[PDB]
Design a protein around this ligand. Structure first.
Ligand code: CA
Ligand code: CA
Ligand code: CA
Ligand code: CA
Ligand code: CL
Lengths: 121, 121, 121, 121
Protein backbone atom coordinates (compact mmCIF):
# COMPACT_ATOMS: atom_id res chain seq x y z
CA UNK A 1 0.00 0.00 0.00
CA UNK A 2 1.01 3.59 -0.48
CA UNK A 3 0.25 6.62 1.68
CA UNK A 4 1.24 10.15 0.82
CA UNK A 5 0.35 13.53 -0.48
CA UNK A 6 -0.24 14.94 -3.95
CA UNK A 7 0.83 18.62 -4.29
CA UNK A 8 -1.40 20.81 -6.42
CA UNK A 9 1.64 22.63 -7.85
CA UNK A 10 3.36 19.44 -9.11
CA UNK A 11 2.72 19.28 -12.87
CA UNK A 12 4.59 15.94 -13.25
CA UNK A 13 2.44 14.28 -10.59
CA UNK A 14 3.42 11.89 -7.88
CA UNK A 15 4.73 8.41 -8.94
CA UNK A 16 3.55 5.90 -6.32
CA UNK A 17 4.87 2.48 -5.37
CA UNK A 18 1.73 0.76 -6.65
CA UNK A 19 2.26 -1.12 -9.89
CA UNK A 20 -1.13 -1.98 -11.31
CA UNK A 21 -0.96 -5.50 -12.79
CA UNK A 22 -3.60 -7.26 -14.86
CA UNK A 23 -6.41 -8.55 -12.62
CA UNK A 24 -5.54 -6.22 -9.73
CA UNK A 25 -8.34 -4.66 -7.72
CA UNK A 26 -7.46 -1.35 -6.05
CA UNK A 27 -8.98 1.10 -3.61
CA UNK A 28 -8.03 4.77 -3.39
CA UNK A 29 -9.27 7.28 -0.75
CA UNK A 30 -8.34 10.98 -1.19
CA UNK A 31 -8.89 13.93 1.18
CA UNK A 32 -7.83 17.56 1.73
CA UNK A 33 -7.93 21.05 0.25
CA UNK A 34 -6.16 22.54 -2.71
CA UNK A 35 -6.36 25.37 -5.22
CA UNK A 36 -5.56 25.98 -8.88
CA UNK A 37 -4.83 29.69 -8.08
CA UNK A 38 -7.65 31.51 -6.27
CA UNK A 39 -7.61 32.10 -2.52
CA UNK A 40 -10.53 29.61 -2.18
CA UNK A 41 -9.82 25.85 -1.84
CA UNK A 42 -11.58 22.76 -3.12
CA UNK A 43 -11.59 19.07 -2.30
CA UNK A 44 -10.57 16.21 -4.58
CA UNK A 45 -13.57 16.54 -6.92
CA UNK A 46 -12.30 20.06 -7.75
CA UNK A 47 -14.39 23.11 -8.67
CA UNK A 48 -17.70 22.25 -10.37
CA UNK A 49 -18.31 25.85 -11.51
CA UNK A 50 -14.96 26.33 -13.26
CA UNK A 51 -14.77 26.09 -17.10
CA UNK A 52 -12.39 23.68 -18.79
CA UNK A 53 -9.70 25.82 -20.43
CA UNK A 54 -7.40 22.94 -21.51
CA UNK A 55 -7.30 20.60 -18.50
CA UNK A 56 -5.11 17.47 -18.52
CA UNK A 57 -8.32 15.49 -17.80
CA UNK A 58 -11.46 16.59 -19.56
CA UNK A 59 -13.70 14.17 -17.60
CA UNK A 60 -12.92 15.76 -14.25
CA UNK A 61 -13.27 19.28 -12.91
CA UNK A 62 -10.39 21.69 -12.57
CA UNK A 63 -8.76 20.98 -9.21
CA UNK A 64 -9.73 17.31 -9.17
CA UNK A 65 -7.41 14.40 -8.39
CA UNK A 66 -6.66 12.26 -11.46
CA UNK A 67 -4.22 9.45 -12.29
CA UNK A 68 -2.27 7.66 -14.96
CA UNK A 69 -1.42 3.94 -14.95
CA UNK A 70 1.83 3.35 -16.78
CA UNK A 71 1.58 5.49 -19.91
CA UNK A 72 -2.21 5.58 -20.04
CA UNK A 73 -4.28 8.68 -20.58
CA UNK A 74 -5.61 10.35 -17.46
CA UNK A 75 -8.29 8.64 -15.45
CA UNK A 76 -10.41 10.52 -12.91
CA UNK A 77 -9.91 9.60 -9.26
CA UNK A 78 -11.83 12.36 -7.48
CA UNK A 79 -12.51 11.35 -3.85
CA UNK A 80 -11.35 7.77 -4.65
CA UNK A 81 -12.04 4.46 -6.33
CA UNK A 82 -13.71 1.57 -4.51
CA UNK A 83 -12.53 -1.96 -5.40
CA UNK A 84 -11.74 -0.83 -8.93
CA UNK A 85 -10.45 -2.88 -11.87
CA UNK A 86 -8.80 -1.04 -14.78
CA UNK A 87 -9.65 -1.27 -18.52
CA UNK A 88 -8.03 -4.02 -20.53
CA UNK A 89 -4.34 -3.54 -21.39
CA UNK A 90 -3.86 -0.77 -18.76
CA UNK A 91 -0.90 -1.52 -16.46
CA UNK A 92 2.17 -0.11 -14.68
CA UNK A 93 2.99 2.40 -11.95
CA UNK A 94 0.17 4.60 -10.69
CA UNK A 95 0.96 8.36 -10.91
CA UNK A 96 -1.36 10.73 -9.14
CA UNK A 97 -1.85 14.27 -10.57
CA UNK A 98 -3.79 17.43 -9.77
CA UNK A 99 -6.06 18.46 -12.66
CA UNK A 100 -5.03 21.87 -14.04
CA UNK A 101 -4.09 23.42 -17.36
CA UNK A 102 -0.56 22.61 -18.56
CA UNK A 103 1.88 25.42 -17.80
CA UNK A 104 -0.41 26.93 -15.11
CA UNK A 105 0.59 24.74 -12.14
CA UNK A 106 3.04 27.21 -10.57
CA UNK A 107 0.39 29.27 -8.68
CA UNK A 108 -1.34 26.21 -7.25
CA UNK A 109 -1.40 25.45 -3.53
CA UNK A 110 -2.29 22.83 -1.00
CA UNK A 111 -2.36 19.07 -1.50
CA UNK A 112 -4.48 15.96 -1.20
CA UNK A 113 -3.71 13.18 1.23
CA UNK A 114 -4.07 9.82 -0.51
CA UNK A 115 -4.10 6.16 0.42
CA UNK A 116 -3.91 3.38 -2.17
CA UNK A 117 -4.09 -0.35 -1.45
CA UNK A 118 -4.57 -3.53 -3.41
CA UNK A 119 -7.74 -5.42 -2.49
CA UNK A 120 -8.48 -9.13 -2.56
CA UNK A 121 -8.83 -10.61 -6.01
CA UNK B 1 -20.51 -4.47 0.77
CA UNK B 2 -23.10 -1.73 0.37
CA UNK B 3 -23.58 0.88 -2.31
CA UNK B 4 -26.17 3.61 -2.11
CA UNK B 5 -27.11 7.25 -1.96
CA UNK B 6 -27.40 9.51 1.04
CA UNK B 7 -29.79 12.51 0.36
CA UNK B 8 -28.76 15.80 1.91
CA UNK B 9 -32.33 16.62 2.97
CA UNK B 10 -32.75 13.31 4.85
CA UNK B 11 -32.43 14.28 8.52
CA UNK B 12 -32.78 10.64 9.67
CA UNK B 13 -29.91 9.56 7.46
CA UNK B 14 -29.61 6.48 5.28
CA UNK B 15 -29.37 3.16 7.17
CA UNK B 16 -27.03 0.81 5.43
CA UNK B 17 -26.87 -2.95 5.46
CA UNK B 18 -23.40 -2.80 7.10
CA UNK B 19 -23.36 -3.90 10.76
CA UNK B 20 -20.11 -2.85 12.37
CA UNK B 21 -18.84 -5.54 14.76
CA UNK B 22 -15.84 -5.44 17.11
CA UNK B 23 -12.59 -5.94 15.24
CA UNK B 24 -14.04 -5.03 11.87
CA UNK B 25 -11.93 -3.01 9.43
CA UNK B 26 -13.94 -0.93 6.97
CA UNK B 27 -13.38 1.15 3.87
CA UNK B 28 -15.71 3.93 2.71
CA UNK B 29 -15.53 6.01 -0.46
CA UNK B 30 -18.03 8.90 -0.92
CA UNK B 31 -18.64 11.14 -3.94
CA UNK B 32 -21.08 13.78 -5.26
CA UNK B 33 -22.42 17.27 -4.70
CA UNK B 34 -24.82 18.51 -2.11
CA UNK B 35 -25.96 21.76 -0.39
CA UNK B 36 -27.25 22.78 3.06
CA UNK B 37 -29.25 25.64 1.57
CA UNK B 38 -27.24 27.91 -0.75
CA UNK B 39 -27.28 27.59 -4.58
CA UNK B 40 -23.62 26.50 -4.35
CA UNK B 41 -22.83 22.78 -3.82
CA UNK B 42 -20.02 21.07 -1.98
CA UNK B 43 -18.44 17.65 -1.88
CA UNK B 44 -18.38 15.26 1.05
CA UNK B 45 -15.96 17.30 3.17
CA UNK B 46 -18.54 20.11 3.13
CA UNK B 47 -17.93 23.87 3.35
CA UNK B 48 -14.64 24.89 5.02
CA UNK B 49 -15.68 28.57 5.39
CA UNK B 50 -19.08 27.99 7.00
CA UNK B 51 -19.39 28.51 10.79
CA UNK B 52 -20.80 25.76 13.07
CA UNK B 53 -24.28 26.92 14.21
CA UNK B 54 -25.17 23.67 16.07
CA UNK B 55 -24.23 20.91 13.61
CA UNK B 56 -24.94 17.26 14.33
CA UNK B 57 -21.13 16.67 14.15
CA UNK B 58 -18.78 19.34 15.45
CA UNK B 59 -15.61 17.66 14.13
CA UNK B 60 -16.65 17.98 10.45
CA UNK B 61 -17.70 20.98 8.32
CA UNK B 62 -21.28 21.83 7.47
CA UNK B 63 -22.32 19.72 4.50
CA UNK B 64 -19.84 16.95 5.30
CA UNK B 65 -20.77 13.23 5.26
CA UNK B 66 -20.86 11.78 8.75
CA UNK B 67 -22.10 8.51 10.24
CA UNK B 68 -23.38 6.81 13.34
CA UNK B 69 -22.59 3.24 14.30
CA UNK B 70 -25.53 1.78 16.22
CA UNK B 71 -26.31 4.34 18.92
CA UNK B 72 -22.94 6.10 18.83
CA UNK B 73 -22.52 9.80 18.45
CA UNK B 74 -21.65 11.12 15.02
CA UNK B 75 -18.27 10.26 13.48
CA UNK B 76 -16.80 12.10 10.48
CA UNK B 77 -16.64 10.27 7.19
CA UNK B 78 -15.87 13.10 4.79
CA UNK B 79 -14.56 11.63 1.49
CA UNK B 80 -14.16 8.27 3.17
CA UNK B 81 -12.15 6.01 5.46
CA UNK B 82 -9.28 3.72 4.47
CA UNK B 83 -8.96 0.38 6.34
CA UNK B 84 -10.41 1.96 9.43
CA UNK B 85 -11.19 0.50 12.84
CA UNK B 86 -13.86 2.06 15.04
CA UNK B 87 -13.22 3.25 18.62
CA UNK B 88 -13.87 0.50 21.17
CA UNK B 89 -17.44 0.17 22.46
CA UNK B 90 -18.95 1.20 19.20
CA UNK B 91 -21.05 -1.39 17.33
CA UNK B 92 -24.16 -1.76 15.19
CA UNK B 93 -25.73 -0.65 11.92
CA UNK B 94 -23.94 2.15 10.05
CA UNK B 95 -26.25 5.06 9.29
CA UNK B 96 -24.94 7.75 6.90
CA UNK B 97 -25.98 11.35 7.43
CA UNK B 98 -25.47 14.75 5.88
CA UNK B 99 -23.99 17.17 8.46
CA UNK B 100 -26.40 20.07 9.07
CA UNK B 101 -28.22 21.83 11.93
CA UNK B 102 -31.19 19.90 13.32
CA UNK B 103 -34.49 21.13 11.88
CA UNK B 104 -32.74 22.84 8.94
CA UNK B 105 -32.62 19.91 6.51
CA UNK B 106 -35.70 20.93 4.56
CA UNK B 107 -33.83 23.31 2.23
CA UNK B 108 -31.00 20.91 1.40
CA UNK B 109 -30.44 19.33 -1.98
CA UNK B 110 -28.33 16.76 -3.79
CA UNK B 111 -26.76 13.68 -2.40
CA UNK B 112 -23.65 11.62 -1.96
CA UNK B 113 -22.97 8.27 -3.62
CA UNK B 114 -21.33 5.95 -1.11
CA UNK B 115 -19.59 2.54 -1.14
CA UNK B 116 -18.81 0.70 2.14
CA UNK B 117 -17.01 -2.62 2.47
CA UNK B 118 -15.38 -4.71 5.17
CA UNK B 119 -11.68 -5.38 4.75
CA UNK B 120 -9.37 -8.17 5.79
CA UNK B 121 -8.68 -8.69 9.41
CA UNK C 1 -6.46 -13.30 12.46
CA UNK C 2 -5.69 -16.27 14.67
CA UNK C 3 -3.02 -18.98 14.58
CA UNK C 4 -2.89 -21.94 16.90
CA UNK C 5 -3.13 -25.61 17.43
CA UNK C 6 -5.88 -28.05 18.21
CA UNK C 7 -5.10 -31.30 20.00
CA UNK C 8 -6.54 -34.57 18.82
CA UNK C 9 -7.08 -35.69 22.43
CA UNK C 10 -9.20 -32.68 23.50
CA UNK C 11 -12.98 -33.31 23.50
CA UNK C 12 -13.52 -29.64 24.35
CA UNK C 13 -11.61 -28.34 21.31
CA UNK C 14 -9.72 -25.10 21.08
CA UNK C 15 -11.57 -21.80 21.40
CA UNK C 16 -10.14 -19.18 19.03
CA UNK C 17 -10.26 -15.42 19.21
CA UNK C 18 -12.34 -15.28 16.00
CA UNK C 19 -15.99 -14.27 16.44
CA UNK C 20 -17.95 -15.18 13.34
CA UNK C 21 -20.67 -12.62 12.57
CA UNK C 22 -23.43 -12.58 9.97
CA UNK C 23 -22.07 -11.88 6.49
CA UNK C 24 -18.45 -12.50 7.47
CA UNK C 25 -16.26 -14.21 4.89
CA UNK C 26 -13.51 -16.39 6.39
CA UNK C 27 -10.53 -18.40 5.22
CA UNK C 28 -9.04 -21.30 7.19
CA UNK C 29 -5.89 -23.29 6.34
CA UNK C 30 -5.11 -26.38 8.44
CA UNK C 31 -2.09 -28.70 8.51
CA UNK C 32 -0.42 -31.44 10.58
CA UNK C 33 -0.77 -35.04 11.64
CA UNK C 34 -3.06 -36.73 14.09
CA UNK C 35 -4.57 -40.07 15.05
CA UNK C 36 -7.83 -41.25 16.56
CA UNK C 37 -6.06 -44.39 17.94
CA UNK C 38 -4.15 -46.36 15.30
CA UNK C 39 -0.41 -46.07 14.96
CA UNK C 40 -0.94 -44.41 11.54
CA UNK C 41 -1.48 -40.63 11.34
CA UNK C 42 -3.73 -38.64 9.02
CA UNK C 43 -4.03 -35.06 7.94
CA UNK C 44 -6.96 -32.74 8.54
CA UNK C 45 -9.33 -34.54 6.14
CA UNK C 46 -9.02 -37.60 8.42
CA UNK C 47 -9.26 -41.26 7.38
CA UNK C 48 -11.45 -41.80 4.36
CA UNK C 49 -11.56 -45.61 5.00
CA UNK C 50 -12.93 -45.49 8.53
CA UNK C 51 -16.63 -46.06 9.38
CA UNK C 52 -18.60 -43.49 11.38
CA UNK C 53 -19.26 -45.09 14.78
CA UNK C 54 -20.87 -41.99 16.37
CA UNK C 55 -18.60 -39.13 15.35
CA UNK C 56 -19.27 -35.65 16.63
CA UNK C 57 -19.57 -34.59 12.94
CA UNK C 58 -21.26 -36.97 10.55
CA UNK C 59 -20.33 -34.96 7.40
CA UNK C 60 -16.54 -35.38 7.87
CA UNK C 61 -14.35 -38.40 8.24
CA UNK C 62 -13.02 -39.69 11.53
CA UNK C 63 -9.89 -37.74 12.40
CA UNK C 64 -10.95 -34.69 10.39
CA UNK C 65 -10.80 -31.10 11.61
CA UNK C 66 -14.28 -29.64 12.37
CA UNK C 67 -15.56 -26.50 14.08
CA UNK C 68 -18.48 -24.92 15.87
CA UNK C 69 -19.54 -21.29 15.52
CA UNK C 70 -21.02 -20.26 18.84
CA UNK C 71 -23.57 -22.90 19.84
CA UNK C 72 -23.90 -24.38 16.34
CA UNK C 73 -23.63 -27.97 15.47
CA UNK C 74 -20.36 -29.15 14.04
CA UNK C 75 -19.27 -27.89 10.64
CA UNK C 76 -16.52 -29.59 8.55
CA UNK C 77 -13.27 -27.71 8.06
CA UNK C 78 -10.92 -30.43 6.76
CA UNK C 79 -7.87 -28.83 5.15
CA UNK C 80 -9.55 -25.43 5.22
CA UNK C 81 -12.22 -23.11 3.84
CA UNK C 82 -11.60 -20.61 1.08
CA UNK C 83 -13.52 -17.33 1.29
CA UNK C 84 -16.46 -19.03 2.97
CA UNK C 85 -19.71 -17.63 4.24
CA UNK C 86 -21.75 -19.63 6.73
CA UNK C 87 -24.79 -21.19 5.10
CA UNK C 88 -26.80 -21.28 8.28
CA UNK C 89 -27.70 -18.40 10.54
CA UNK C 90 -24.74 -18.97 12.91
CA UNK C 91 -22.75 -16.55 15.02
CA UNK C 92 -20.17 -16.57 17.75
CA UNK C 93 -16.72 -17.75 18.67
CA UNK C 94 -15.07 -20.33 16.45
CA UNK C 95 -14.09 -23.49 18.36
CA UNK C 96 -11.94 -26.00 16.52
CA UNK C 97 -12.34 -29.70 17.31
CA UNK C 98 -10.93 -33.05 16.26
CA UNK C 99 -13.61 -35.41 14.89
CA UNK C 100 -13.81 -38.58 17.00
CA UNK C 101 -16.47 -40.52 19.00
CA UNK C 102 -17.26 -38.92 22.39
CA UNK C 103 -15.53 -40.73 25.18
CA UNK C 104 -12.93 -42.32 22.89
CA UNK C 105 -10.47 -39.42 22.74
CA UNK C 106 -8.09 -41.01 25.31
CA UNK C 107 -6.06 -42.85 22.70
CA UNK C 108 -5.73 -39.89 20.31
CA UNK C 109 -2.48 -38.22 19.50
CA UNK C 110 -1.06 -35.34 17.53
CA UNK C 111 -2.56 -32.03 16.54
CA UNK C 112 -3.50 -29.69 13.75
CA UNK C 113 -1.92 -26.25 13.19
CA UNK C 114 -4.58 -23.78 12.00
CA UNK C 115 -4.75 -20.21 10.61
CA UNK C 116 -8.04 -18.31 10.44
CA UNK C 117 -8.71 -14.86 9.03
CA UNK C 118 -11.58 -12.69 7.96
CA UNK C 119 -11.65 -11.76 4.27
CA UNK C 120 -13.06 -8.75 2.44
CA UNK C 121 -16.81 -8.62 2.22
CA UNK D 1 -8.75 -15.94 -8.18
CA UNK D 2 -8.46 -19.44 -9.63
CA UNK D 3 -10.12 -22.74 -8.84
CA UNK D 4 -9.11 -26.00 -10.49
CA UNK D 5 -7.86 -29.55 -10.19
CA UNK D 6 -4.29 -30.89 -10.17
CA UNK D 7 -4.03 -34.51 -11.36
CA UNK D 8 -1.52 -36.70 -9.58
CA UNK D 9 -0.41 -38.27 -12.84
CA UNK D 10 0.39 -34.96 -14.60
CA UNK D 11 4.17 -34.80 -14.54
CA UNK D 12 4.14 -31.34 -16.26
CA UNK D 13 1.84 -29.89 -13.62
CA UNK D 14 -1.23 -27.77 -13.94
CA UNK D 15 -0.69 -24.12 -15.14
CA UNK D 16 -3.03 -21.70 -13.38
CA UNK D 17 -4.24 -18.23 -14.47
CA UNK D 18 -2.47 -16.63 -11.50
CA UNK D 19 0.64 -14.60 -12.20
CA UNK D 20 2.48 -13.92 -8.95
CA UNK D 21 3.76 -10.36 -9.11
CA UNK D 22 6.16 -8.52 -6.82
CA UNK D 23 4.51 -7.63 -3.54
CA UNK D 24 1.55 -9.95 -4.00
CA UNK D 25 0.11 -11.76 -1.01
CA UNK D 26 -1.65 -15.03 -1.81
CA UNK D 27 -3.76 -17.64 -0.13
CA UNK D 28 -4.04 -21.23 -1.34
CA UNK D 29 -6.34 -23.92 0.03
CA UNK D 30 -6.03 -27.48 -1.30
CA UNK D 31 -8.21 -30.54 -0.68
CA UNK D 32 -8.70 -34.09 -2.04
CA UNK D 33 -7.19 -37.55 -2.29
CA UNK D 34 -4.40 -38.86 -4.48
CA UNK D 35 -1.78 -41.64 -4.71
CA UNK D 36 1.73 -41.97 -6.08
CA UNK D 37 1.14 -45.72 -6.70
CA UNK D 38 -0.16 -47.65 -3.67
CA UNK D 39 -3.83 -48.46 -3.14
CA UNK D 40 -3.98 -46.05 -0.22
CA UNK D 41 -4.64 -42.33 -0.91
CA UNK D 42 -3.26 -39.32 0.88
CA UNK D 43 -4.28 -35.68 1.15
CA UNK D 44 -2.21 -32.67 0.00
CA UNK D 45 0.52 -33.08 2.64
CA UNK D 46 1.31 -36.47 1.12
CA UNK D 47 2.68 -39.51 2.88
CA UNK D 48 4.82 -38.59 5.82
CA UNK D 49 6.17 -42.16 6.20
CA UNK D 50 7.44 -42.65 2.67
CA UNK D 51 11.20 -42.23 1.97
CA UNK D 52 12.35 -39.60 -0.53
CA UNK D 53 13.61 -41.52 -3.57
CA UNK D 54 14.36 -38.56 -5.82
CA UNK D 55 11.26 -36.41 -5.46
CA UNK D 56 10.86 -33.18 -7.39
CA UNK D 57 10.67 -31.32 -4.02
CA UNK D 58 12.82 -32.55 -1.18
CA UNK D 59 11.09 -30.26 1.38
CA UNK D 60 7.70 -31.90 0.99
CA UNK D 61 6.56 -35.50 1.31
CA UNK D 62 5.91 -37.89 -1.49
CA UNK D 63 2.39 -37.17 -2.77
CA UNK D 64 2.29 -33.59 -1.51
CA UNK D 65 1.11 -30.63 -3.52
CA UNK D 66 3.94 -28.32 -4.62
CA UNK D 67 4.26 -25.44 -7.05
CA UNK D 68 6.63 -23.37 -9.17
CA UNK D 69 6.38 -19.60 -9.57
CA UNK D 70 7.87 -18.66 -12.91
CA UNK D 71 11.39 -20.03 -13.05
CA UNK D 72 11.59 -20.70 -9.32
CA UNK D 73 12.55 -24.03 -7.89
CA UNK D 74 9.77 -26.13 -6.46
CA UNK D 75 8.07 -24.65 -3.40
CA UNK D 76 5.89 -26.73 -1.02
CA UNK D 77 2.15 -25.97 -0.90
CA UNK D 78 0.69 -28.89 1.08
CA UNK D 79 -2.84 -28.09 2.34
CA UNK D 80 -2.21 -24.42 1.48
CA UNK D 81 -0.55 -21.11 2.27
CA UNK D 82 -2.09 -18.41 4.40
CA UNK D 83 -1.47 -14.75 3.40
CA UNK D 84 1.82 -15.70 1.97
CA UNK D 85 4.55 -13.65 0.28
CA UNK D 86 6.96 -15.49 -1.95
CA UNK D 87 10.58 -15.53 -0.66
CA UNK D 88 13.69 -14.37 -2.58
CA UNK D 89 11.70 -12.11 -4.91
CA UNK D 90 10.36 -14.90 -7.21
CA UNK D 91 7.62 -13.97 -9.72
CA UNK D 92 5.58 -15.26 -12.67
CA UNK D 93 2.93 -17.84 -13.44
CA UNK D 94 1.99 -20.37 -10.82
CA UNK D 95 2.18 -24.02 -11.84
CA UNK D 96 0.81 -26.64 -9.43
CA UNK D 97 2.46 -30.09 -9.36
CA UNK D 98 2.07 -33.39 -7.51
CA UNK D 99 5.32 -34.38 -5.73
CA UNK D 100 6.64 -37.72 -7.06
CA UNK D 101 9.87 -39.05 -8.60
CA UNK D 102 10.51 -38.01 -12.23
CA UNK D 103 9.49 -40.79 -14.61
CA UNK D 104 7.21 -42.48 -12.08
CA UNK D 105 4.03 -40.49 -12.59
CA UNK D 106 2.36 -43.06 -14.77
CA UNK D 107 0.88 -45.08 -11.93
CA UNK D 108 -0.50 -42.09 -10.04
CA UNK D 109 -4.19 -41.50 -9.42
CA UNK D 110 -6.59 -38.97 -8.00
CA UNK D 111 -6.27 -35.21 -7.79
CA UNK D 112 -6.34 -32.22 -5.53
CA UNK D 113 -8.92 -29.42 -5.76
CA UNK D 114 -7.19 -26.07 -5.32
CA UNK D 115 -8.30 -22.45 -4.78
CA UNK D 116 -5.82 -19.58 -5.16
CA UNK D 117 -6.56 -15.95 -4.44
CA UNK D 118 -4.72 -12.70 -3.98
CA UNK D 119 -5.04 -10.99 -0.64
CA UNK D 120 -4.90 -7.35 0.47
CA UNK D 121 -1.63 -5.61 0.17
CA1 CA E 1 -3.13 27.16 -11.70
CA1 CA F 1 -30.03 23.42 5.66
CA1 CA G 1 -9.96 -42.43 19.67
CA1 CA H 1 4.33 -42.93 -8.90
CL1 CL I 1 -6.77 -28.19 22.01
Amino acid sequence: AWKGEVLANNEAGQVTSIIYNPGDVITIVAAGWASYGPTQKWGPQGDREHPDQGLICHDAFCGALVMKIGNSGTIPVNTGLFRWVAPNNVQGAITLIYNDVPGTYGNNSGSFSVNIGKDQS
